[model samples]
Target: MKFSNITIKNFRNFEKVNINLDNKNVIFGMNDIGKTNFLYALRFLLDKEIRKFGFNKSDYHKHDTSKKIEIILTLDLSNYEKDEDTKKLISVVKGARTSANADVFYIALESKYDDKELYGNIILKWGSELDNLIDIPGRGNINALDNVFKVIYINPLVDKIVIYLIEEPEISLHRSMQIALSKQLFEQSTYKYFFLSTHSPELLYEMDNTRLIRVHSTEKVVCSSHMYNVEEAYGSVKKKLNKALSSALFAERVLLIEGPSEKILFEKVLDEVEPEYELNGGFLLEVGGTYFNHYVCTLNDLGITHIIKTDNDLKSKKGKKGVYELLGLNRCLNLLGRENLDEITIDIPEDIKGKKKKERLNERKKEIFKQYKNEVGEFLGERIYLSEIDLENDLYSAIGESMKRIFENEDPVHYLQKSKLFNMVELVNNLSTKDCFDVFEHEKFACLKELVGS
Candidate 1:
């Protein structure tokens, strides 16, 4: 039976973790986080000749933290339950089987101190049978029964659930579309799961129901979600993610800001701040104000660390734009950090059209922002940075002289409402790197340096 789900516990760095298997799978993240362990965990239970290199003490949690290791696989028997011999084999433990509604058989690969000496042991843990037992002497062990099950299970049915591993699949092809057809290759071919020896984000972005597993040292799989949600979002928000945005996925770190003014301004002083940012595949992505959530969802799914810089929107005539954007961003992050979330957007209302209608709308949004601003928790500028009000206001406060240089005689507030993208870039260029650095050093821009480098 092919695995539909897997539960690994007390094995090496994997203290305990459960994953829902899929037709496609890609394991990625920083290094040494048990990407290799998932394979060995499978080999221990499925490889017929694995006894020669059987389980060792170090294979247990952190080498010695725990006494037992269990890697239970939930196999889908849905395809085979109909055959007479398959029914006969299942009848042995059908009483312990999960549910008739879904044909699932749980087989736990278990090992510990004494068992390792015997080449370890396997268990039909979730659904059972002691009839699956055999004695030793030159006769049986983990590899023995494990192989017995593999070979015998063959008689009950025909199957082609193949598992193949490839490394940095991007090299074999110049485009993600070339890698995408590999899915068509599998479509013609269960349930084929192509695990990457390593990953290129594009390799993962192309697969359907790709179990995008992020391996982190703290636990094991930090997050797991299908790339389907990401792919669904790509086309709708393509305009917002324009111009070299996919490069953001390759970045070591990212900075998501709203508006082109930020893009031009940040890029100007970035060299003064994080000199190696561009050199090391880091980027400043302007996700725009209303569409911040869409891009946030994308970044989180891709597991890219980022600094979310945004305007407070207190000065917005339409009320609390920043808070609403954060609400969406929080949901996206919730999905990214765990394995779970995005379906929210901002739009101008038809009701608030006439003069007094505009007044009512602004007051309601303003009131709601004050009441709900405390709820967002990003105004403190931790990972999310909020300007005192917005870019024009905040930047002008920081560089009164610089703005004065451009709008030599105009009122500052008028210039703010009228500030063009190039105007912000103009001011940024006017400053010496030292002067630009001084402005960015403010608390509003504090997360900038840290998010980019460390």
Candidate 2:
């Protein structure tokens, strides 16, 4: 069975969304444009067993309090194998209410089989005060809807598939695992409808122009049915993948050292000794050593081609080969045991050395607090620091506190905050302006070219 089309009304973020289904369909949109919720609508319709997935009556946001959520789904049963002929199937559940007292449920299934269109309508009204008013069809198993969903839609990350819904799906995987998983997902799925929402140009190229949707947000959700010239997009993914393999510095041409220590110790020294090439962009990620590859993969997937400098104990070569091999960048460069390589090392601060992780973290917190104190003392900014921190905290707290507020309306600021996460944003903001040199700074970039194999 396949859905020829689906129309959702007043469901979550979508006041109304109409999707026409084909053998392969892609749903693309910016964050909070209701892509995930659209799937939920279908999940609710096909499966009446809501509580199975903790999708209880409470899950419904009671937006239209006067009326229950009305979900209608029209399924095409043209190929539904039976003793009879094939035709269309239409299913709809209208006027569903969830209240503390009682609820009403309605279901209608219409289809033609054996030259007779079998139509069934089930309505359960609050005739008498019952414990749970919702009734399931005798023929409909509780697992039916879930089975359909399992067969149809698979969340990229949940399944460990290379089909990433957003960029940076490789963050948690080894480099080889990243490539391996992608190939496996494509090979395994037997569903008629295959939909992938992704910004990874690698994923896009692997998909080819066939069954692809490019989404962008201008005023509203905009979509392109066909893939355009994404040579730049391909390059951006390659550069990011390369950065993931080697140093974050590969992203930029000019590296800016942030602090006095970094300026004197790392970039200036490396410029003299290292092989030629100018650096660009802000100082390479200021995060820690172990986290560098993660950040690199993240930034690269996001198409950040230019990066500045920040060094590690590259010369020590401690497990560099093992780390690179784990990350799938081993064959490209022998990261282990490079003695002349330049790096900046700071003395382990007296307060933090030999301390436990929590104690060291607390020490860093104290450092921030001291900065706040100094700012207040120097500027007569009484409560200024507290005010800023409070503002940030309150917004974070509000997300959990004001549950009802979401259904009523969203604070515009709250909506803006949601966009900052990696899941919400695409790797490339604009593909048209990305430069080839910016994208393919190293030969390893060609590895991504073959990995994607467009």
Candidate 3:
């Protein structure tokens, strides 16, 4: 099946829906936006049997009985597969193929109340036009397509829309098999469209012929999108794209920061007051400076909601929304310091093909951040919230009074760097949402709570 795309109307949670699909798709979103229901709708069209068959009347949008349910799938037979059932599938719908889209074919499932109806009647039709769907006999009669689709069609599989939906495909699979399954999901050309409703990013990692389809609800109307070829578009930064930053792509909202300290400290604060963040589909990600823009651009392209909190950065509104510049670039670079480099964990020496940490820092300062470093406060967008002077200054300003009052002790400035990781955890000792909103006046944390919870 070569599925160009699909259109759904009056289906559960979808008043109307449409999306262009790819070879392998990772279906994602917040808790409930009908990822499962969308899959079921496709099953109704392509799969012969569904446990949730028919117009149960409840499957209708808002339980609407007046409007009939339509699950329309468009096909592109330009590049199809070789299989007995697949060829038969082509034979049934081929005559109706149109030049509307080079080689266009559409099939549908229309479910509604028939006059003097007992339950509901689901009419199966296929053709080149949505307006004129050639009827395939329904009313409990076996049709031609009903036979071909009765079993999984294709020896191999579509832009013409053939499909496979796997639920919790990673369950009990060893790590190697999980990887193998993800690869297989993409390479199985016999499938016209591949959809996986998954939690693990591992299933989504193989970039070849894959896309992240976000099925999110706007008000009550569920919609879907987020399509770009990862392997092709970002083949430039494949290694960085494969890192933990990719996890942010899967969440409904992401808190993007720059490295270990932010990740640990944010978790400390989250543990104290905002445990629901992760539980409610929020991800805290530390994309180091070297790869920060890659994550930012990926998130920006996908239109996923995000909050970027960094020590200091600049956003350029002149061009794209949320065009942020990573300030404190030197601090970000020195993450692999001499002592760490001396630890000798890496096979390649730092000086061999790589610039020494300081040399790289010098080059970055001389060339990069030269333009954006001077530009602050002019930063665009509310999503990016940076420090006034630095991460330490703002936090100390927020809890300065509270520290003396609660502990009856005063810590000097720069205490945040005392042990970087531990000091940040210690800072969370008496911190609360009150400080994030009122005292600290940090909108990033405030937005974090709001995005992740009520």
Candidate 4:
């Protein structure tokens, strides 16, 4: 048997919440969003130890002891083949089978109190079983009769046990370990169901998208069909992206770039302009140019605000295409909010060779440049940008002389290669703050700042 869903009312921090469950569900949100409270509601229904403690005044919402706290868990037993333990449980409970011949049941716990005094006893009922028929003994043997379904709460500090609820399994564990734990719980478990509350992206990274639920304010839950689609989109490329890249899920604003050079340069420049920008909720994602739209589709579904920074790799003849080139001249025109390609004049050469071919390419390049100059201002309104050239070429053009001096007069390519070898971010960190400030003053840097700011 497995719990299909749960409903809680008048519990601490939860006014009324009804959430559907998956075979393995993940609960996540910002801190103080009552993630733990949702787990405690499960404990009230499933944890035999907690059930024995009974309801107290502090357990009620806002300490309002006059209100009754109710927790209802709906269990699905349609696929359950009765074993000896299940048969014994079925025999002890009355009206446990639904009209459709499924052995479904509802386990409910309601608060018991007299006047202002908090009662240490709970009215536990299943199906139409006798109300208050089973009283808690002083020894608290709620699970003494059967152990068919074991409900265990897993934590980072504790050794793993088979259970139904887990709280922050990522805590105190390395990111890799957290990912392994997530896989173990969702993919390799023997438990009927599992519920996890976590704040780690590594844990979230390994989850099936459909099983994730985001908690907002008190009693507010947000999970939509679009989010499911986002998960599907994310799942398509999750393996290639890896867990570190998945960390973008936790960022407030994501800046998508094509390659590591852009990532390194932008991060260094941004730091020079505004130090510790990541700590201020900004994130840089290296999406490898070709996969921007895939990431964009996923982020859009997740409602994550993001901007794309790409290179203007427009072409005259069909060569290898980058994102902008593959999008085609007309699409670029439309994106830049310009006139149709038919409106632009082009000189066709019968036997285009050498200088003429270069001239023709330059003409096409100029037209594309004009389109950018016209529409880039408006593109920023939607937070999309294109570098004038490729990132490496742009960087060289911007600060090639300054870099040569820094690298003891070595060529710019050699300097960049060595910088990448030592780790780009670390290399940037080692640069003088004044040199970084100069790089930030370049035109590309200005565009990046505007995109990030917008």
Candidate number achieving the greatest lDDT relative to the actual structure: 4
User: On a 0 to 100 scale, what is the lDDT of residue 214 in model 3?
Assistant: 66
Supply candidate 4's per-residue lDDT for 186: 48
Q: Can you write out model 3's per-residue Cα lDDT over 9-74, one digit (the tens) per residue?
A: 887777766787765677776655576677667777656556235567677767557787777777
Q: Where does candidate 3 have its weakest 10-residue lDDT segment?
A: 338-347
Each prediction's TM-score against the native?
Answer: 0.63, 0.33, 0.65, 0.65
Residue 409 of candidate 4: its Cα lDDT? 52
Give the whole-model CA lDDT for all candidates, comma-separated. 0.54, 0.34, 0.58, 0.60
**Which of 1 and 4 is ahead in lDDT?**
4
Clashing pairs in 1: none
Looking at candidate 1, what is the lDDT of residue 454? 49
Order of candidate numbers by lDDT, starting with the best: 4, 3, 1, 2
Error of 3 at 328 (Å): 6.5
Report the alpha-carbon TM-score of model 2 versus the true structure.
0.33
| Per-residue lDDT of candidate 1, residues 1-454 (tens digit) | 4557777877777766888666567666665546667766666665566535656656666657337776666666665645543454355544564446646555555554654344544442445332342222134444223423441111111222245544444544567564465556444553344555455444333334455565553566454544433456456554344343545654667877656656777777776766666776577766653445555655676566767665533232255452233343343335234332122234556655665554454454455456546645643433666443456666666666666666577755445456576556556556786667776677656766665564
The ten-residue window of minimal lDDT in model 1 covers 151-160
After superposition, candidate 2 runs with Cα above 4 Å error:
47-62, 79-136, 139-171, 174-179, 185-191, 208-210, 213-454
Clash pairs detected, candidate 4: 152-163
Error of 2 at 382 (Å): 59
Off by over 4 Å in 1: 1-4, 10-17, 49-53, 56-69, 76-103, 112-159, 170-192, 217-254, 277-283, 289-307, 312-389, 406-425, 444-454
